[PDB]
Scaffold this active site. Sequence first.
Site, PDB file in Angstrom:
ATOM      1  N   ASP A  58      -1.633  -4.795  -6.139  1.00  0.00           N
ATOM      2  CA  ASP A  58      -0.470  -5.587  -5.770  1.00  0.00           C
ATOM      3  C   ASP A  58      -0.681  -6.946  -5.184  1.00  0.00           C
ATOM      4  O   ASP A  58       0.056  -7.211  -4.248  1.00  0.00           O
ATOM      5  CB  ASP A  58       0.652  -4.785  -5.177  1.00  0.00           C
ATOM      6  CG  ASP A  58       0.779  -3.399  -5.631  1.00  0.00           C
ATOM      7  OD1 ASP A  58       0.584  -3.032  -6.900  1.00  0.00           O
ATOM      8  OD2 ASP A  58       0.783  -2.135  -4.910  1.00  0.00           O
ATOM      9  N   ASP A  65       3.024   7.151   5.710  1.00  0.00           N
ATOM     10  CA  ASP A  65       1.574   7.381   5.960  1.00  0.00           C
ATOM     11  C   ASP A  65       0.842   6.043   6.723  1.00  0.00           C
ATOM     12  O   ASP A  65      -0.317   6.008   6.802  1.00  0.00           O
ATOM     13  CB  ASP A  65       0.618   7.869   4.735  1.00  0.00           C
ATOM     14  CG  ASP A  65       0.768   7.063   3.632  1.00  0.00           C
ATOM     15  OD1 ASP A  65       1.251   6.008   3.644  1.00  0.00           O
ATOM     16  OD2 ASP A  65       0.205   7.306   2.486  1.00  0.00           O
ATOM     17  N   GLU A 125       8.255  -2.238 -13.295  1.00  0.00           N
ATOM     18  CA  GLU A 125       8.280  -2.719 -12.017  1.00  0.00           C
ATOM     19  C   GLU A 125       7.605  -4.178 -11.708  1.00  0.00           C
ATOM     20  O   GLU A 125       7.135  -4.521 -12.735  1.00  0.00           O
ATOM     21  CB  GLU A 125       7.575  -1.578 -11.140  1.00  0.00           C
ATOM     22  CG  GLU A 125       5.994  -1.486 -11.347  1.00  0.00           C
ATOM     23  CD  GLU A 125       5.704  -0.355 -10.745  1.00  0.00           C
ATOM     24  OE1 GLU A 125       6.221   0.377 -10.027  1.00  0.00           O
ATOM     25  OE2 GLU A 125       4.257  -0.325 -10.815  1.00  0.00           O
TER      26      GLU A 125
END
Length: 318
Positions: free
Chosen positions: A9, A61, A192
């Site tokens: 990304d 996390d 997305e």
Amino acid sequence: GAKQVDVHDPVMTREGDTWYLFSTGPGITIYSSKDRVNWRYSDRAFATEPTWAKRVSPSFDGHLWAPDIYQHKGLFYLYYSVSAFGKNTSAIGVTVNKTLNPASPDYRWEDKGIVIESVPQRDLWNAIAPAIIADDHGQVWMSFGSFWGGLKLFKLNDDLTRPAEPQEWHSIAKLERSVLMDDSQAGSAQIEAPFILRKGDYYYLFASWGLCCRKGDSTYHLVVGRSKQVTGPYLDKTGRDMNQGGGSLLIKGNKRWVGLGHNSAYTWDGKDYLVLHAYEAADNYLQKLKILNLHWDGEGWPQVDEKELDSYISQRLK
Ligand SMILES: [Cl-]
């Protein structure tokens, strides 16, 4: 360096004569480079994590997702996503720094908190994957989204930390979903990661279609549409609105690169560039950085040469 740099990304910016690269990872991973090819580790934006992250995502996390970097009035704005896999318990935050050089006396990331948060059963969208775009009228916008009811655009306030009030929103791209589906489920709308680039008389909306992160079965690829105004509608090569499933193919994978996407795009010194990750089949499908030269055809549509997936070879420095 010796191995290619692994990112997911990716976004980029330049400060003075230094390039900076931001990736999904613990605290958002930051690299630096003099030539856009040879990259050293620079920092992580959060030494640990945003103070609020666990309340949005109880099983958080430490991995922040899908950063965007934006320069505005002398500062650096780094947008980032707190989420959980498969769910829309998510929020986009922003942290700000005076500089990107970690040796600088001015260097410090300062979190400004939650820009926007999605809430299961309230919102038919997912608050991840921000991208920042300015228009010709002094206004700054955020696009974002993943699955659910698709990709959205809203107007930012004067400090770029929250929605402007009164709020103004626009849908920009969507794939099919019935509202009778359970609101907590992602759905079959595999869309997305919006990114908008102004070029000539149009705004170009790039989006990722299909499934990332699944080895030999990844179908992730990039599509595009274009609009005269930043607020839409974005149409594809056939004149189909991206709000009804329009989108023209820009680049898809091949035998060596199985799935690719979640892009950004930039104009640097009079030329254009597409920035993305791609999963390398010969290296356990490990995502590598790829920067490709972005061209424009006779009909006004972006074009890339897929051979540059092989010839662009980043190097991770010691
Ligand atoms: Cl992004």
